[PDB]
Symmetry: C5
């Protein structure tokens, strides 16, 4: 796991095999991407205009098996800059600002061909904050899917509630759930898979 | 369609597109202007200021055109592919009454279809100066957005327009009507005519 | 001629010739004479004003033109003009002496190059300036100046020649703006500073405006 | 040696040699031992404080050093150190876990390379953090806790090792009572392996 | 003879072939003498509570690299060059509390005798003593500018005729005095000295 030249070699191999603009399909099956959200913070919450500002830890994984190697005497994982990798084109449907990445833009590649990209993000969303002061709290739903690939090319999926959530927040997390969802729009005949993350939270009392 | 996931067939189409594609040159065919279809679909309203007459909107910008030099036989290969928009010509659209840089909320990819059609449909948050009077009244306020090609006159580029289903439930405002008109203006600066789509939007507060 | 404007292959060749000849970092001087650059502002919107700090926020259309005849070609059977990315062309290095923010370009960064070596670049720009705003409430309006000059090139290399004057200054201006424009004028100035024995040419633009209603 | 240092050609050759031996995307691990990165925060200012929202704005000088023997050269008759743009060098991927903004880098982005293989990267950063701010308008003051860790590399590849009004501003509204720096290894339920990090405790109060 | 376009492009080519942008241009084993002056253009704001100050200043940097020099007998005396092609000094304000914002194009003059001039106009926020701004004596704010990564054996900053000369007449504030001075500090992390120039600005509000 710890020879610089072995790492430089693995990296070199990934840079040949990997085509960054082409989706990594195997055997006529959609690429199976698994998304999961962990919340880190809730910073602002406007009940008049229906917006929140959050920081979340976005764990995405997929399998590009052509990147795989034998690791019996070499390292099992390495870090690659994401400009050298195809990453999925996920978008959050009810975002109202550009996503702001707060972490170095690197992925792990695992010798079985698995790719993990888990950046931490700040973003404002437009959502229902009705009930944020009550005891049963508000429920804001976030929708996240593949922007330009339909369900026959990219298949999204959902992989404790407050394990990484700051203790210095004004808000508290009651429950967080994730549901897979295939949806068609009147524009395009094809479906787009998304994950709907439903966060249930309230102000602290 | 059944052959939509050959990673190799896909890579080959991307390669092909990158060779034929001339990103800086308008893809005219047969001495006709490029016809570009332009439409908005509103997603949200974020800020309304009745004093200064401004509005923040997130709208979904539907833009399509064709370049038959990119076409291919898709009988046994993928029907569409995604392409980074730096590899294709894109039209230089501009909103005349906009007062801030447009902010693109989605990945900057276009779809290319086997028949030579190109679809670029970004989601955009932008700020416009427009008439926002009547917004607390039953008829509502009517605000227009004028979107035309900036450098190419009508002789080279024409823009044509092709209810808020994708409009947020949680917005403070409600849409009443959305119409789309085609204008063709000659400015006192240049002897030629620039075309544009006008998008009139009637909207009002809820309660 | 206008009849051949669209032939895709012809346009590409013109774009190719332009890149082979254009030197983006060199002033296109002709015959021991300075490069003449025509400058015209047209105001679009006056976004905000602060009478206490003396700042304004404007959107203007900045029309700029100049000649490089080494770019010319025979338009007898060819497109008369084409659009070019400005990264492929020399562009004048104009600065706003009293800008207090970076310029934000609103529009696509493309120039039109015409078949006789004329280049037009007219972006739309939002910028914040520092100027005299007192009077803005009265009926005679306020009067705010903006100096714009060549930063690193002096008069014998670049001369900004005033493109004035209107009609017409209230034409591209938002009618839905809190403010209205009385008059606009332009002046060519030529200043020699402490540092350099060389003189820099600038264009002073005066905008007279008041709050409506 | 100190005499050499000013030879424009000698430096050019050193800088050439570094760009060739340096691979920016590979951790400079030697001997099967995890790269040791020494980190150190010196505070410079405390600017925006919100007691209601638990946010703070700080300008701090981050001091980072590590060792890469492959970059080393015989400096008997050449310069002992040179400046290098960090685009030419591997730099560790550090990240503040409680930062709620993107770091704003206030200084030129150069590192120093010493001829014995030490690399020194010491940028001045402004950044907003989410932390315990209550107690700030009182004498024992507040106690914030920034944590700085290796994002994608775990303990077997990168290991952080720790190491104060000297560089702090006397024109700050705030003043500093104590600063401590502990090493911390923690395992998150996602990945089997542990990540090293440095909890920097800052103790400070408003004036008067 | 300053305008022959071919002579310019040739000079610009010679400059790119011999110039190494990442290497300090030292000569005869002496440090590089970088000369620095600040002329103030404006003051945007002042916060008495927090000791912040927003200022627009014209930074005047000049230094020599005799390896760029050419014979200007029948070619131009000077030319403009993108700073990406040249080595440029890594200056920094110790008491800056914001990213510097360059308001001007990033071009340097090169003079044929080997001299380089980089003179950008900059907008930056500083933290400094601001008390006394309303009083007739005025407040005194100190900016400390120095070389960040290069110590004194490598780069030395030397300050080089009245202010209120490029200073905006429309400012709330007026400048009472400006003095430049040179210090040389060693910090407890590293045994080599770093030179800086402290610009002292004495100013007050107007009546
Ligand atoms: N997942 C997803 N994808 C698209 C989409 C479809 C096609 C294109 C294309 F091909 F034109 F580039 C772009 C986006 C649009 C879309 N919606 C648009 C309206 O807001 C809800 C989501 N959602
Ligand atoms: N569509 C459009 N195009 C232009 C335009 C822009 C650039 C050029 C040039 F010089 F590059 F050729 C010409 C016209 C100007 C224009 N107007 C200018 C003022 O605002 C209303 C619209 N509208
Ligand atoms: N047109 C113009 N050019 C300069 C100028 C800029 C850069 C250089 C240098 F050093 F790069 F050569 C010289 C003069 C400075 C200048 N002024 C600076 C002070 O405010 C009034 C305008 N105006
Ligand atoms: N040092 C560190 N690293 C991670 C982490 C980031 C990326 C990856 C991946 F996907 F690249 F493998 C793994 C762990 C996560 C993490 N924390 C978990 C999120 O909350 C803050 C602390 N801390
Ligand atoms: N001019 C200067 N340089 C440094 C400095 C910067 C980088 C490095 C390193 F590590 F990259 F070599 C060393 C010292 C530090 C420094 N100060 C330390 C605190 O901030 C005020 C002054 N001032
Ligand atoms: C993996 O490692 C080496 C050769 O690469 C060898 O010991 C072993 O047989 C390999 N196993 C597989 C499944 O290729
Ligand atoms: C499309 O491709 C296949 C193979 O070349 C062929 O069967 C079919 O006739 C082609 N169609 C056209 C339009 O040429
Ligand atoms: C352009 O016109 C002719 C015909 O295209 C060409 O041969 C000649 O070089 C040019 N001269 C004229 C007539 O402008
Ligand atoms: C380095 O070079 C010097 C001078 O050439 C020589 O004396 C020495 O043996 C070399 N080895 C070391 C000390 O690394
Ligand atoms: C330029 O010509 C020569 C050769 O470059 C040079 O040495 C001298 O300084 C100049 N000659 C004149 C005419 O002054």
């Amino acid at each position: 796991d710890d020879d610089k030249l072995d790492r430089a070699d693995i990296l070199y191999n990934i840079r040949q095999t990997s085509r960054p603009d082409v989706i990594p399909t195997q055997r006529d099956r959609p690429v199976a991407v698994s998304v999961s959200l962990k919340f880190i913070n809730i910073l602002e919450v406007n009940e008049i205009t229906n917006e929140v500002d959050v920081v979340f830890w976005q764990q995405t994984t997929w399998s590009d098996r052509t990147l795989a190697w034998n690791s019996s005497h070499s390292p099992d994982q390495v870090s690659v800059p994401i400009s050298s990798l195809w990453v999925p084109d996920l978008a959050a449907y009810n975002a109202i600002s550009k996503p702001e990445v707060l972490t170095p833009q690197l992925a792990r590649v695992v010798s079985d061909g698995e790719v993990l990209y888990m950046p931490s993000i700040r973003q404002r969303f437009s959502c229902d904050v009705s009930g944020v002061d009550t005891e049963s709290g508000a429920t804001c739903r976030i929708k996240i899917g593949s922007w330009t690939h339909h369900s026959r090319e990219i298949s999204v999926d959902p992989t404790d509630d407050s394990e990484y959530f700051s203790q210095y927040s004004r808000f508290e997390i009651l429950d967080v759930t994730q549901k897979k969802n295939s949806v068609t729009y009147s524009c395009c005949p094809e479906a787009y898979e998304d994950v709907e993350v439903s966060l249930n939270f309230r102000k602290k009392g």
